[PDB]
Structure 1
Amino acid sequence: RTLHMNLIVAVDGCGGIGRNGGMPWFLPAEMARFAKLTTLTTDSGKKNAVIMGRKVWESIPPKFRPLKSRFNVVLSKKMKEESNENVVVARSFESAVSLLQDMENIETIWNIGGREVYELGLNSPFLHQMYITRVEGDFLADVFFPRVDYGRFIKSTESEEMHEEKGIKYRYEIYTIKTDK
């Protein structure tokens, strides 16, 4: 019935997310939380889906492709079809979402992005929550998170401490779309 689409992203002080096709940092504890948030489901036997762009797919080491215990959906007009049954190449955002709402064993769609994928999620009726990791500093990024109006959301007020790995500081933020709260 209810099918949420959540956004999860780590942005720096200028909203940057990507550099030279990869991520501008490596935060193992932050990424373990990413893996847990995008994998764990309320209903066991049900799965979560991750929707991503081709460049996010190419940024994952092939030994970790596809992302374990999740149904992978890759948006691309150029990619050949993936024979792996846990991966589907979707030619459009609308067809990807329609396919995911068709499969009943999917509990939550996690938009793991690429700027355009995040942008389409921000305009989706299924938009539910944004899980933003705000990293301190300017990491000289060449790809940025979409310009989002935070006034559309309610910021969750749970206590959020500062984190640090490898001399990199960051804090967690959670937002809920205002029509859902």
Structure 2
Amino acid sequence: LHMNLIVAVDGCGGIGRNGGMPWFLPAEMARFAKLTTLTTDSGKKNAVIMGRKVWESIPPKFRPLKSRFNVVLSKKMKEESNENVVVARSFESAVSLLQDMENIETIWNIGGREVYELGLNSPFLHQMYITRVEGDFLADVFFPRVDYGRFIKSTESEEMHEEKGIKYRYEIYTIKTD
């Protein structure tokens, strides 16, 4: 059972501004949905684990994230009536429930700085799929401080991408104990 982190950070390490995203990148978001949705074993599902403010920053039409199992960490949210969503009061309990479910193939840590930090300290930590966006978007939330020395960066050829006047590039990292 793998836990991969997926994030889009800017030149300063920013991920959030004013409770929302500092940018909108539809092609990047499409790649995000593909990476987080597609499983190898047909019929098996992925799980996304997110913090409450991520959940609330998703457009409610796209919410819950379709074809995935949503786990929202929150100490304040009421239980979610929907079946593809569960509210988990702690990281450890969320990870316990996920490793308990048989049909979950890969757990995608999709955001919340604290969610990211707890994942980075997790035994299930596998890969980081980072989208390095160029420039300073005046973010107020950031990605955790991470020791990249624990990781091996994939060497595949990664071109630059540009949409909406914004440039960015994909990077992949794998924990060195694999």
Q: Identify the TM-score tier after normalising by the shorter chain.
A: over 0.9
Aligned-partner Cα distance in 2 for 1:64–1:170: 24
TM-aligned CA deviation for residue 113 of structure 1: 1.1
TM-aligned CA deviation for residue 114 of structure 1: 0.6
Aligned-partner Cα distance in 2 for 1:122–1:104: 23
Q: Deviations over 1:36-75 (max 9, x none)?
A: 0000000011000000000000000111110000000000
Aligned-partner Cα distance in 2 for 1:113–1:152: 20
Aligned residues: 178
Q: TM-score, normalised by structure 2?
A: 1.00
Structure 2 gap ranges (5+): none
Say which of 30, 54, 57 aligns to 1:56.
Answer: 54
In structure 1, the partner of 2:81 is 83
List 4+ stretches of structure 1 deviating above 3 A.
Answer: none
Aligned-partner Cα distance in 2 for 1:169–1:61: 24
Aligned-partner Cα distance in 1 for 2:21–2:118: 21
Aligned-partner Cα distance in 1 for 2:135–2:72: 30
Q: Deviations over 1:96-147 (max 9, x none)?
A: 0000000000000000011000000000000000000000000000000000
Q: TM-score, normalised by structure 1?
A: 0.98
Describe the SS at the equivalent of 1:36.
helix
Is residue 2:137 matched to residue 1:136?
no
Aligned-partner Cα distance in 2 for 1:46–1:97: 17
TM-aligned CA deviation for residue 171 of structure 1: 0.3
Aligned-partner Cα distance in 2 for 1:30–1:88: 26
Aligned-partner Cα distance in 1 for 2:22–2:28: 14
TM-aligned CA deviation for residue 95 of structure 1: 0.2
RMSD between superposed Cα atoms in Å: 0.3
Structure 1 gap ranges (5+): none
Aligned-partner Cα distance in 2 for 1:166–1:62: 24
What's the % identity of the aligned pairs? 100
